[PDB]
Design a protein around this nucleic acid. Structure first.
Lengths: 203, 146, 161, 56, 94
RNA sequence: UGUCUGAAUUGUGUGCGGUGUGCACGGGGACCCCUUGGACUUAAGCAUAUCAGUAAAGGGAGGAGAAGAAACCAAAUGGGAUUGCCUGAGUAGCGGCGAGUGAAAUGGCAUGAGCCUGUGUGGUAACUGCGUGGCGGGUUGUGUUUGUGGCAGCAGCG
RNA sequence: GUAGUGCAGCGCGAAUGCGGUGGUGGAUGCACCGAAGGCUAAAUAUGGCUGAUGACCGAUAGCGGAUAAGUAGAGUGAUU
RNA sequence: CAAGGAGACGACGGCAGGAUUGUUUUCCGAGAGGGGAGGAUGCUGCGGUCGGACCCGAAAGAUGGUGAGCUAUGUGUGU
């Protein structure tokens, strides 16, 4: 099929053709700003496997993120406590950088809803991601039952609450005994149930 | 009845039973089991001498359902027959019971004398050597089952 | 002080919480009214589904049977049926389970045929009302296990009964 | 227990119980929190998880 | 289970039935369209720099030096052997 | 019906159109999801440890939320999505092997339910947002009929 | 979670009769499963509001507050 | 002088006295190996541990906020 050929090409990043197209388009992104709109998909077939359609009410934005360890701001490294808590410089963030990019694009368009995202390039200082967003107020979206689920009320700002695929990845969910610390639905609700003592009336 | 409560007889007596010279203070001695190698060392020596230290191999995740091997003695094996069928066997002394301990929750057979001088058949996993002697001594026989 | 077992009572966390329902008699009967109200909103159909007989896993529970989750597609086919059509007749289907025993496969085929002979088909809720069909909140054909009985032979105890 | 009371310490010729902060009202400077103070709390407050029933 | 119990052990006779199981993997009636797409991709695209430097080690004869350079840069040992098997057959065809 | 104010906006950001017309912002936050993150205290001192990933702070939701249909558990003649309770068990284990800390499977109950998609015609896009037999989108791929009818229930008023 | 139980930064970066897992690092048999796209009732939690109850308190008690009470009054202010 | 004012409550274990019933028991050993020997479920009291823990009391530590109308220094504009 037509989609088989495009998949085999896009998998070979860094082979003599993708190394030409990556350098040419990442030079475009460096001249735009922090978050901007694009009209067609970069990797057409990776975007359709993540849920994109050619229809009114679908939108694409590109956002960059700044690439390194997280910051801690104490004046000259004074942290006002014990020495096991006094590290400043090699602390790693809890979320992924693909999820940080969704939070940038989701505040810029507060009337839309985020669906998924994917990698499109890289710099020495930045990485670039491609965010797919949907219009919850258009009637083209509210009328068809393949995307209709996103127009109700529990679906607002999915990427702030950890409900997209990139931000889901860091919650610690799964199957079997290697995922005992999330039984009940998350880490915090495993903690609460195990820190509760239940008693019967007749005891 | 049944000794109402000490506090009811202590009203009026200063210090409520805890002494005047030595008093009732907070945690004089440390909390819980502190001092176990220094000032409470006489406590562990007199009452719990095997409590500290390591001793042994450490298996992560012992598997208990697969190691269940509950034993029963040959000395009973006859009071195990249910109450209804028991009088049927004691009245006709020419029939042989066929009892399978596995259907009552037991796995291994050990133990002593058979409580009667008639033959029987007994199925299980793993009879020990002494159980084999006392089942054969009455004319019965033993079998290994699943 | 004294000779006692060493205590291990865990109350060192201020974040701990206690939980008690102080009236479980009114809570049980409020849930039995919910259960009888679903039953006559599904009226003709009995609110519980037919489930198979299965076998407990390890060597400790080897000799015990039990009600399981659902029937397989081969057990439904040999009872004269398609698993898409067994689900419209109140039968639970489980496509994860695998078929590896021929005796157990046969008990479950006869459990389906027995159930298929105790149901009646109609065309409307009006007919079932007029024929005496009532609502059902219990479970369909519960499994009970039998008592242990002792076999008996007579002085032929060398052919190894 | 609905105050920000604090004891005044010794050196002022009054007893050591904690006392209300402020001014301009007769509540200012009076005792608080203790089981022997007017408007205090009970030494051992009554709780809901005591045993009410028994088993026969 | 105890070792004395495993010797006299006796299992239950089961009478296994006959019914087909699942498929589990890439299907056998689509190799033609999978083999065709991979033969178009290698003509279009070139070679990665890592595959260039590894056919030059196989070029001389150094099947060992090429074996450790691929095991260091692909974080596996089962994978580094499956790759020097493809890059050897592309020389015979070539 | 509701003076003058207050997000307080004749604004800022953004979708669809092509100059028309939408949407977001604040309030509250007991319970829920995500981020960040203490010290008092216990170890009869104290630095790893403990208190505790808890309090405080910030962002985002609802009548609940989150989770969920095996790249599972196991080692039998095998079970079979998620969530809650009892047993397992203060146990296996972690730990200046100190003080301390700490699961799960099986078994028994409650409740039970499974589906949609990225490769759909070629004898003709079979599709739909706006409008009354047309415009906009779409081949870099759209594919969305129907309830003043029936059945069961819940609250209120006189 | 004991020699990753899970998560993240930086760097390297896969496969197509193929891939993943089996409480000690690695090898090899046998067993069991298909990740990296999407949705999903019920049984569970809980300030406040409204109904119904109680071996609860009876004006220094019970909510701070049985009355024109977060009022009179105090503080530059946050607050009290 | 009046009124108020301090060993009560929860969890887990032991023993004493009392109630109902009684056809009760998975052992040794690090392991490899070896292998028959009257309690259970409630009720009241006392001793033990962790809980604010018989009642009242520090000098301190941390998280989040308010102030240059007193007073200190710089700077614009007047006397």
């Amino acid at each position: 099929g037509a989609v088989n050929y495009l998949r085999e090409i896009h998998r070979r990043k860094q082979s003599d053709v993708m190394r030409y197209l990556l350098r040419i388009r990442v030079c475009e992104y460096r001249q735009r700003g922090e978050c901007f709109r694009v009209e067609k998909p970069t990797f057409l077939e990776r975007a359709r496997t993540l849920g994109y359609k050619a229809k009114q009410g679908y939108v694409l934005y590109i956002a960059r993120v700044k690439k390194g360890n997280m910051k801690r701001n104490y004046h000259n490294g004074n942290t006002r406590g014990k020495c096991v808590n006094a590290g400043i410089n090699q602390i790693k963030p809890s979320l992924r950088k693909q999820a940080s990019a969704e939070m940038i694009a989701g505040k810029k368009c507060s009337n839309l809803g985020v669906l998924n995202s994917y990698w499109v390039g890289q710099d020495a200082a930045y990485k670039y991601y491609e965010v797919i967003m949907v219009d919850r107020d258009h009637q083209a979206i509210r009328n068809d039952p393949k995307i209709n689920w996103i127009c109700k009320g529990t679906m607002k700002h999915r990427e702030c609450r950890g409900l997209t695929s990139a931000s889901r990845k860091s919650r610690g969910l799964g199957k079997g005994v290697k995922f005992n610390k999330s039984k009940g639905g998350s880490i915090r609700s495993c903690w609460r149930r195990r820190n509760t003592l239940v008693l019967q009336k007749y005891r | 009845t049944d000794r109402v409560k000490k506090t009811r007889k202590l009203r009026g007596h200063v210090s409520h039973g805890y002494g005047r010279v030595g008093k009732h203070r907070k945690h004089s001695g440390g909390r819980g089991l502190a001092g176990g190698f220094s000032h409470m060392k006489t406590f562990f020596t007199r009452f719990h001498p095997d409590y500290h230290g390591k001793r042994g191999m450490r298996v992560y995740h012992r598997k208990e359902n697969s190691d269940y091997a509950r034993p029963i003695s040959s000395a009973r094996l006859w009071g195990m027959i249910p109450k209804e069928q028991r009088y049927d066997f004691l009245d006709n002394p020419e029939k042989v019971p066929v009892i399978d301990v596995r259907e009552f929750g037991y796995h291994v057979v050990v133990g002593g004398k058979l409580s009667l001088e008639r033959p029987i058949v007994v199925k299980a996993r793993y009879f020990t050597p002494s159980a084999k002697e006392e089942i054969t001594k009455v004319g019965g026989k033993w079998i290994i089952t699943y | 002080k004294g000779n006692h077992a060493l205590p291990n009572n865990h109350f060192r966390k201020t974040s701990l919480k206690i939980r008690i329902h102080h009236d479980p008699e009114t809570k049980a009967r409020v849930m039995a009214e919910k259960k009888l109200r679903k039953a006559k909103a599904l009226f003709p159909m009995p609110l519980k589904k037919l489930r198979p007989i299965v076998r407990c896993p390890t060597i400790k529970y080897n000799r015990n049977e039990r009600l399981g989750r659902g029937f397989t597609a081969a057990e439904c086919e040999k009872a004269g049926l398609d698993y898409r059509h067994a689900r419209r007749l109140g039968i639970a289907v489980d496509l994860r389970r695998r078929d590896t025993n021929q005796e157990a496969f046969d008990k479950n085929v006869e459990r389906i045929k027995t159930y298929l002979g105790k149901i009646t088909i109609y065309e409307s809720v009006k007919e079932a009302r007029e024929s005496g069909a009532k609502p059902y909140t219990k479970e369909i054909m519960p499994f009970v296990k039998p008592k242990p009985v002792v076999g008996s032979i007579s002085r032929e105890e060398v052919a190894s009964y | 227990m609905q105050h920000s009371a604090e004891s005044w310490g010794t050196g002022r010729a009054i007893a050591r119980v904690p006392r209300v902060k402020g001014g301009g009202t007769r509540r200012a400077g009076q005792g608080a929190f203790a089981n022997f103070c007017r408007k205090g709390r009970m030494a051992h407050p009554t709780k809901t998880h005591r045993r009410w029933a028994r088993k026969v | 289970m105890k070792n004395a119990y495993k010797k006299v052990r006796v299992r239950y006779p089961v009478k296994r039935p006959d019914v087909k199981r699942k498929q589990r993997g890439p299907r056998a009636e689509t190799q033609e369209s999978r083999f065709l797409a991979a033969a178009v991709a290698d003509e279009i695209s070139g070679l990665s720099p890592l595959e260039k430097k590894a056919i030059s080690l196989l070029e001389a004869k150094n099947n060992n030096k090429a074996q450790k350079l691929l095991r260091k840069r692909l974080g596996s040992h089962k994978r580094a052997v499956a790759k020097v098997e493809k890059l050897a057959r592309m020389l015979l065809e070539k």
